[PDB]
Amino acid sequence: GTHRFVQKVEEMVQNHMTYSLQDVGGDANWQLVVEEGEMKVYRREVEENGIVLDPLKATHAVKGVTGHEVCNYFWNVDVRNDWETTIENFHVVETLADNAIIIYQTHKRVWPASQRDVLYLSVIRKIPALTENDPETWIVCNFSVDHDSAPLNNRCVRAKINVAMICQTLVSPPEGNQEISRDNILCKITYVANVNPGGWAPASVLRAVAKREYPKFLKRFTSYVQEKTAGKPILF
Ligand SMILES: CCCCCCCCCCCCCC(=O)N[C@@H](CO)C[C@@H](O)c1ccccc1
Numbered sequence: 001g002t003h004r005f006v007q008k009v010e011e012m013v014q015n016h017m018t019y020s021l022q023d024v025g026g027d028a029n030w031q032l033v034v035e036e037g038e039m040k041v042y043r044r045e046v047e048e049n050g051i052v053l054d055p056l057k058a059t060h061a062v063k064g065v066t067g068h069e070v071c072n073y074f075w076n077v078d079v080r081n082d083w084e085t086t087i088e089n090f091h092v093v094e095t096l097a098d099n100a101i102i103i104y105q106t107h108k109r110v111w112p113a114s115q116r117d118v119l120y121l122s123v124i125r126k127i128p129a130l131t132e133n134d135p136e137t138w139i140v141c142n143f144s145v146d147h148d149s150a151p152l153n154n155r156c157v158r159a160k161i162n163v164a165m166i167c168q169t170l171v172s173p174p175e176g177n178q179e180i181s182r183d184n185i186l187c188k189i190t191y192v193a194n195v196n197p198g199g200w201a202p203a204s205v206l207r208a209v210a211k212r213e214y215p216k217f218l219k220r221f222t223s224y225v226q227e228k229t230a231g232k233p234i235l236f
Pocket residue numbers: 084086087107110116117118142159160161163193195197210213214217
């Protein structure tokens with residue numbers, strides 16, 4: 001890439017590829033707090049100076065869609081309002097490259113506290129597979145940056161985030177005369193969110209809200225991808 005954020009991008013992608021994919025089922029620092037179908041949501045309870053920082057990690061398996069398609073839909077701001085429910089307003093501050101943009105958005109008051117805004121670079125990347133026996137990996141990384149055109153606000157507390165949707169397509173070609181259809185593909189998703197609320201709020205409530213809102217998002221967003229891609233040619 002040309003843009004000034006290319007080095008930071010690579011470091012964020014690499015951290016997610018090494019630390020975010022790590023299996024969290026047997027990790028006793030993590031707690032499985034939501035299960036429904038193929039979806040599991042885990043959290044690690046962390047606070048600094050009384051501020052709840054709990055890392056969130058979800059895993060999902062979604063039939064009939066690819067990692068490329070799920071990542072495309074997650075990244076593409078032209079469809080954000082089709083699925084996102086926690087945002088009041090957003091706009092693109094800057095386009096850095098064809099796969100990378102900076103976004104400013106304000107969120108609905110889902111917490112018992114001042115309204116939050118966030119200012120993040122959103123980038124979509126493909127990580128090639130080492131062999132044709134393995135899945136290619138598609139990732140969208142959303143991470144807080146600074147921008148002159150979006151300074152701190154009077155009205156909102158500036159949250160900071162480090163989020164990744166990491167997706168891999170598994171395929172199971174059919175036995176004989178049939179061509180591959182969407183019944184033969186499944187997308188494995190890992191979604192990780194590390195959110196700094198930028199100020200204090202009761203932890204009990206913040207945790208209740210995260211337990212509610214992330215599984216809600218994931219079900220609605222993945223369903224939306226399934227609907228919008230149904231009966232379409234598969235994008236690997
Ligand atoms: C910025 C803190 C204010 C929101 C408080 C938490 C609400 C839970 C949101 C669940 C849905 C996450 C959807 C999600 O991942 N959304 C994208 C696109 O809007 C931006 C994102 O990477 C993010 C993650 C987490 C918080 C805000 C924004």
